[PDB]
Write an enzyme that holds these catalytic residues in place. Structure first.
Site, short mmCIF file in Angstrom:
data_model
loop_
_atom_site.label_atom_id
_atom_site.label_comp_id
_atom_site.label_asym_id
_atom_site.label_seq_id
_atom_site.Cartn_x
_atom_site.Cartn_y
_atom_site.Cartn_z
N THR A 28 48.89 41.49 32.98
CA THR A 28 48.06 40.76 33.48
C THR A 28 46.59 40.58 32.79
O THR A 28 46.49 41.81 32.11
CB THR A 28 47.80 41.05 34.77
OG1 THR A 28 47.23 42.38 35.13
CG2 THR A 28 49.24 41.12 35.55
N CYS A 29 45.75 40.08 33.10
CA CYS A 29 44.37 39.95 32.35
C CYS A 29 43.27 39.52 33.26
O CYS A 29 43.78 38.60 33.93
CB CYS A 29 44.22 39.22 30.88
SG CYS A 29 44.74 37.53 31.14
#
EC number: 3.4.22.71
Length: 211
Positions: free
Chosen positions: A189-190
């Site tokens: 995820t970012c």
């Protein structure tokens, strides 16, 4: 209409896969006409995860831009600018937002439950060079202080270590075995640039070519 747009795109791709069933290049030749930066496609049947994978010159080129270069918070699912496709590295990383609306990489969170893992063991991944299966074997919550984002290793002992920790940290357990001779793909995820959320979720899978 970001959702509808993705639906439109997903539908086009499904047609392409049907059309050029026994093929691999034509689908992405088509996609490239959209944006030459679309290097692949990721999909997990039964989930919202069904989008194109882009890659720019940096890890921020597509953080906030979608496949058709449009400004979007959720941006795109993108491959680390350091990774190569033709000759896949030890570990290939692609990133995506986790905003909490079952889109992009919201599904990663689900791989944290053993039951979801059992019914979604393999993720589909394709590109101009072939079709691939991503057999998940690890999913855990971490932070930006730990770099599971390493591309290559000095040697097998080094890569063995990495693989070892990867499994140790896994919150789920899987019969899939991975060795220093196998290729890996980590899904992460970012957060937008300059976001103070350092918490992340990572899912690592063994890349297997089936094309």
């Amino acid at each position: 209409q970001e959702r509808a747009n993705y639906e439109k795109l997903q539908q086009k791709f499904q047609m392409l896969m049907s059309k050029h069933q026994a093929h691999v290049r034509p689908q992405f030749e088509s996609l490239e006409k959209i944006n030459k930066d679309i290097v692949g496609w990721i999909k997990l049947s039964g989930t919202s995860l069904n989008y194109p994978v882009l890659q720019g010159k940096t890890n921020h080129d597509y953080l906030n831009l979608d496949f058709e270069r449009e400004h979007r918070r959720k941006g795109s699912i993108f491959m680390d600018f350091r990774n190569e496709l033709k000759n896949l590295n030890h570990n290939t990383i692609l990133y995506g937002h986790h905003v909490g609306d079952n889109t992009m990489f919201d599904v990663l969170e689900d791989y944290l439950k053993q039951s979801f893992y059992e019914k979604h063991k393999i993720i589909e991944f394709d590109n101009k060079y072939g079709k691939y299966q991503l057999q998940v074997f690890s999913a855990y919550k971490t932070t930006t202080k730990d770099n599971y984002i390493r591309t290559d290793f000095e040697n097998d002992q080094d890569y063995q270590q990495f693989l070892d920790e990867t499994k140790r940290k896994s919150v789920i357990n899987s019969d899939v075995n991975v060795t220093v001779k196998d290729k890996i793909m980590t899904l992460s995820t970012c957060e937008d640039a300059y976001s103070e959320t350092t918490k992340r979720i990572v899912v690592v899978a063994k890349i297997i070519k089936v094309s």
